[PDB]
Structure formats: structure tokens, C-alpha cells
């Protein structure tokens, strides 16, 4: 009767990087990145390989979270254009 809806889904991708520290290979903790849609582990790793060409970047986890932005229909008529 009164409610509308609009869904936004984003996947938070946690990444890590091999780096040289004092002549040893160690793991840099990278800031997590967020993308639009629901990405699997394989999808995210493909994106990371696209974004960081040749870099030793590992996707370590993917976390999808979906938000449902809703507005009363009455609220929408106030701002929408008749078109």
C-alpha cells in the first residue's frame, strides 16, 4: 500500500599482498575493497588480477551484503516528476 523498495548489493573483498621485507617474503594486509554486485571468491580474484596486473595480490575473503532502500509512495510523489 505505502512502501516502495530499491535493492543495492555490494561485495566487500578482503585482499593481501606478498612483499619483500628484509630479504624475506611476507604478507602485507591491504585495505578491503568494495564492488557492485555479488562476487564469488573466483569473481573477485579475477577483478584483482585485472586491477593489479602481475602483482601478488590474493583475495582472502568475500562478504556480500544487501541493503534495501525504501520510501513511502507518498514521499516519492512529492519529489518525482510526472513525465
Numbering used by the authors: 1 to 83
Publication excerpt:
The genome-organizing protein p6 of Bacillus subtilis bacteriophage φ29 plays an essential role in viral development by activating the initiation of DNA replication and participating in the early-to-late transcriptional switch. These activities require the formation of a nucleoprotein complex in which the DNA adopts a right-handed superhelix wrapping around a multimeric p6 scaffold, restraining positive supercoiling and compacting the viral genome. Additionally, p6 forms dimers that bind to DNA every 24 nucleotides and interact with the viral DNA through the minor groove. In this work, we have shown that protein p6 showcases a remarkable evolutionary design that encompasses a folded core as its foundation, upon which, two structural regions play crucial roles in dimerization and oligomerization.
